[PDB]
Design an enzyme around this catalytic site. Sequence first.
Site, PDB file in Angstrom:
ATOM      1  N   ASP A  15      31.350 -31.227  76.584  1.00  0.00           N
ATOM      2  CA  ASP A  15      31.867 -32.647  76.931  1.00  0.00           C
ATOM      3  C   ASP A  15      32.390 -32.192  78.499  1.00  0.00           C
ATOM      4  OD1 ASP A  15      35.110 -32.723  75.011  1.00  0.00           O
ATOM      5  OD2 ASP A  15      34.220 -31.154  76.721  1.00  0.00           O
ATOM      6  N   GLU A  45      30.490 -42.718  75.253  1.00  0.00           N
ATOM      7  CA  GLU A  45      30.286 -41.472  74.654  1.00  0.00           C
ATOM      8  C   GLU A  45      28.896 -40.854  74.787  1.00  0.00           C
ATOM      9  OE1 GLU A  45      34.146 -40.532  73.837  1.00  0.00           O
ATOM     10  OE2 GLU A  45      32.562 -39.283  74.157  1.00  0.00           O
TER      11      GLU A  45
END
EC number: 3.2.1.17
Length: 164
Positions: free
Chosen positions: A20, A11
């Site tokens: 994202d 991440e």
Amino acid sequence: MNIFEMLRIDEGLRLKIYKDTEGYYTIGIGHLLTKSPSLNAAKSELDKAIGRNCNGVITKDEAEKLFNQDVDAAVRGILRNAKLKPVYDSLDAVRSCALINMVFQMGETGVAGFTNSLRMLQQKRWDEAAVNLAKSRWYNQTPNRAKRVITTFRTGTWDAYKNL
Ligand SMILES: [Cl-]
Ligand SMILES: [Cl-]
Ligand SMILES: [K+]
């Protein structure tokens, strides 16, 4: 290697609101804020989550706090889910992290939908599950991450994260 290091690697860490891979407002270590296309909505969600007026930015300690909460939620979710729990219970410690990783990324409903793959992991047919897992939107949209996770399910080792 442990679940926190593994996810920190997949991440990354960002202290300012960002989009994202799917275009959703996120912050910290992959903490999704909202699916709404509104930065405004995202900021409000951030404030609510942290408990102060952030103006879209947070500290590292705050990122890590969200992160601990998020891993906890993923694990608890898996354990509460009738489709996921049996699989998780059958897996060794290393492979269990791969399952947690998928849940963190896609949510419990997303993962519980991988029924054929889940059945293969339960039966310990590592190679077959690996092929089945790869036949998915998940693999085609985030191939490098999916490869790391799948390799983890296949081998039961950390080799895919090792030396990164
Ligand atoms: Cl596909
Ligand atoms: Cl990727
Ligand atoms: K387990």
